[PDB]
Amino acid sequence: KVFGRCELAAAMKRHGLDNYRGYSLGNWVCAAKFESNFNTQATNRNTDGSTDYGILQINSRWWCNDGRTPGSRNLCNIPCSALLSSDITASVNCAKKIVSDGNGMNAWVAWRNRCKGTDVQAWIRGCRL
Ligand SMILES: N#C[C][C][S]([C]C(=O)[N]C(=O)O[C][C][C][C][C][C][N][C]1[C](C#N)N([O])C2=C([C]=[C][C]=[C]2)N1[O])B1234B567B89%10B%11%12%13B85%14B%1158B%12%11%15B%139%12B%1061B%12%112B5%153B%14874
Ligand code: NA
Ligand code: NA
C-alpha cells in the first residue's frame, strides 16, 4: 500500500505512535517518507546481507526474522514479511521497540539526516488528525 501523508499520520496516531518516546507525529511521518516513500512493500538489501522492510525500513540484523541474515536477532518476534503488510500494526509495534533501544530516532539514519532539526510539523500540516 502506498499511504498518503495525512492518511499515514492518522494511522500512526491511532496505533499510538504520536509522541511515543517524545517524538511528535511529524517525526514519524518524515521518517516514513524518506525510508519508504510511504510504501508498505518497500524492501532494501544492506551491504552486510541484512534487509530493511516496510514503511519504516526495519532491519533483519536485529528486529525481525527473514531466514537469510546469519547471526541476526529477531527482537520484535516477527517474520520480516509482517512488516510489509497494508496494516501498519506490526511495523508500529516494532518501531516502538526500536525507538526505545537507547538511540531514539537516530536508529533511522534517514531521520537523522533528513528530519532531525527540521520543520517536522510540516509533515502533518493541514491534516485532520
Ligand atoms: N530552534 C529555534 C529558533 C526558532 S526562531 C523562530 C520562532 O521562535 N518562531 C516561533 O515562535 O513561531 C511561532 C509559530 C510556530 C509555528 C510552528 C509550525 N511551523 C514550523 C515549524 C514548526 N513547528 N518548524 O519547526 C519550522 C518551520 C519553518 C522552517 C523551519 C522549521 N515552521 O513553519 B528563529 B530565529 B533565527 B532564524 B530566526 B529564524 B530562524 B533562526 B531563529 B530561527 B527562525 B527565527
Ligand atoms: Na509522550
Ligand atoms: Na533477524
Curated annotation (Swiss-Prot):
Subcellular location: Secreted
Reaction(s) this enzyme catalyzes, per UniProt: Hydrolysis of (1->4)-beta-linkages between N-acetylmuramic acid and N-acetyl-D-glucosamine residues in a peptidoglycan and between N-acetyl-D-glucosamine residues in chitodextrins
Alphabetized InterPro entries for the sequence: Glyco_hydro_22, Glyco_hydro_22_CS, Glyco_hydro_22_lys, Lysozyme-like_dom_sf
Domain C-type lysozyme intervals: 1-129
Record key words, sorted: Allergen, Antimicrobial, Bacteriolytic enzyme, Disulfide bond, Glycosidase, Hydrolase, Secreted, Signal
Alphabetized GO MF terms: beta-N-acetylglucosaminidase activity; identical protein binding; lysozyme activity
Active site, UniProt feature: E35, D52
Residues binding substrate: D101
Cystine connections: C6-C127, C30-C115, C64-C80, C76-C94
Top-tier EC class: hydrolase
Enzyme nomenclature, EC number: 3.2.1.17
GO cellular component: a single term: endoplasmic reticulum
GO BP, sorted A to Z: cell wall macromolecule catabolic process; defense response to bacterium; defense response to Gram-negative bacterium; defense response to Gram-positive bacterium; killing of cells of another organism
Chain's role: Lysozymes have primarily a bacteriolytic function; those in tissues and body fluids are associated with the monocyte-macrophage system and enhance the activity of immunoagents. Has bacteriolytic activity against M.luteus.
Record note on quaternary structure: Monomer.
Miscellaneous information on this protein: Lysozyme C is capable of both hydrolysis and transglycosylation; it also shows a slight esterase activity. It acts rapidly on both peptide-substituted and unsubstituted peptidoglycan, and slowly on chitin oligosaccharides.
Name of protein: Lysozyme C
